[PDB]
Every structure is written in structure tokens, then in C-alpha cells.
Design a protein around this nucleic acid. Structure first.
Ligand SMILES: [Zn+2]
Length: 97
DNA sequence: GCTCAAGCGCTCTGCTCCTTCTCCCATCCTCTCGATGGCTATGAGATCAACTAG
């Protein structure tokens, strides 16, 4: 099976995904023109398209942390995460021994 | 410009981690080997309460 989703470039999606295509969500069977064979699936996609159409001065201490690179560092550098890093490594140390 | 908001710092748990601290480790029996263990004097003053007379 193929996603066969209608891309903005006019070509059907050729991604080979078992269940879900990341750029188009769930994968449903489609014909040569990229139309879902199930009429219910066509209606659901139309509803999704309608929903999409409907849709001091200096950075404070909290505002400075509000970004991408800080968020990933906070998750990586955590008391529970570091302990889980050690705890996971302890279990392979038992396997190594 | 008059009310709901947005924040906001301060406080209250609280949640887990790390550290610290006390206890605990079968029963009974025999024997030997060692260690330990203390031992100033003598006299002077002064008080006091009990006999021994008065
Ligand atoms: Zn796709």
C-alpha cells in the first residue's frame, strides 16, 4: 500500500508506511487519483480540511528559558533522568558482570 | 478607564535522594593460656560523746 496523499506539488505521496504517514496522519487506501476508496474517509478528510481553514521589554528570567534549546536541556538534565540514566546503566552492569 | 486578567513573589508542602545511625547475627558443653591483682608512714592538733569519779 501507498499513502497516495495529494501533495501541493500535484504528485501523489509515495511514502511506504505501514500504518501512519507523518505528513498526512493515518493512511487510507486510495485510487490512482489519490481519493480514499471509503466514502466515510473522504468525508472525514473534508471535515479535517474545514477545521484547518477555521484555525519589561527585555526577556525575563522565565522568558529567557522559553525557547527550544533550553527545553531539551531541561529534560536531558533532570534529577530523575540522570538517576534513570544510572539505573539503566546499573542494570546492564549486572548483565556485564 | 473600571474588572477581569496576568503576573508574581512568597510560602507550604512534598518528593525523592543522599547521608547518617542503631542493631543484629543457633544452642549447649569441655579444656588450657594469659593478665590481673596494691600493700606511703607517724605525728601533731582539735573536737566530741561517753565513763568515772566528784
Ligand atoms: Zn503520505
Amino acid at each position: 500500500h501507498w499513502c497516495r496523499a495529494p501533495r501541493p506539488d500535484g504528485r501523489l505521496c509515495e511514502r511506504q508506511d505501514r500504518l501512519k504517514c507523518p505528513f498526512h496522519g493515518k493512511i487510507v487506501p486510495r485510487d490512482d487519483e489519490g481519493r480514499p476508496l471509503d466514502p466515510e474517509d473522504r468525508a472525514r478528510e473534508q471535515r479535517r480540511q474545514l477545521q484547518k481553514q477555521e484555525r519589561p521589554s527585555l526577556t525575563n528570567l522565565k522568558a529567557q528559558a522559553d525557547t527550544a534549546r533550553a527545553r531539551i536541556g531541561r529534560k536531558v538534565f533532570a534529577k530523575a533522568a540522570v538517576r534513570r540514566v544510572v539505573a539503566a546503566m546499573n542494570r546492564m552492569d549486572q548483565k556485564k558482570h
